Structure formats: C-alpha cells, structure tokens
Amino acid sequence: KNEDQEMCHEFQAFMKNGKLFCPQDKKFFQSLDGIMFINKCATCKMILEKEAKSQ
C-alpha cells in the first residue's frame, strides 16, 4: 500500500528477472504523465540497485 514497500509500481513491469530497463520510450516526456514517470524512471532504477547491496 505505501510506496515505502513498492516504490516502483509502473516500472516494475519494466523489470526482466531483476533487470530494470527504464530507458525504453521516454518520448512520454512530451506529456505530464511522461514527465512524471520519466522522473520516477531514473529513480525507480536506483531502487533496484539498492537490493544488490543487501546481498
């Protein structure tokens, strides 16, 4: 429920077995939703890199 457990909600689908390919179609930048997701993209990506430090 809280974003403190699943910060990546839409980008999650962009994860291929632990591989987050955020760089896909940022063209959405031409819109607010795109400007937003794109802002959460580069960020949602580092969210996965954090799991690599736990193990």
Radius of gyration over alpha carbons? 12 Å
Can you tell me the overall shape? globular
Largest sheet: none
Order of helices and strands: H
Number of helices: 1
- Determine and state the CATH class: Alpha Beta
PDB class: putative serine proteinase inhibitor
Keywords: putative serine proteinase inhibitor
Assembly: monomeric
Entry title: LEKTI domain one
What does this structure look like?
This protein is mainly α and 55 residues long. It has a single domain, classed as Wheat Germ Agglutinin (Isolectin 2), domain 1 (2-Layer Sandwich), CATH 3.30.60.30. 42% of the residues lie in helices and 0% in strands. It is built from 1 helix and no strands. It is globular, with a radius of gyration of 12 Å. It comes from Homo sapiens. This is Hemofiltrate peptide HF6478.
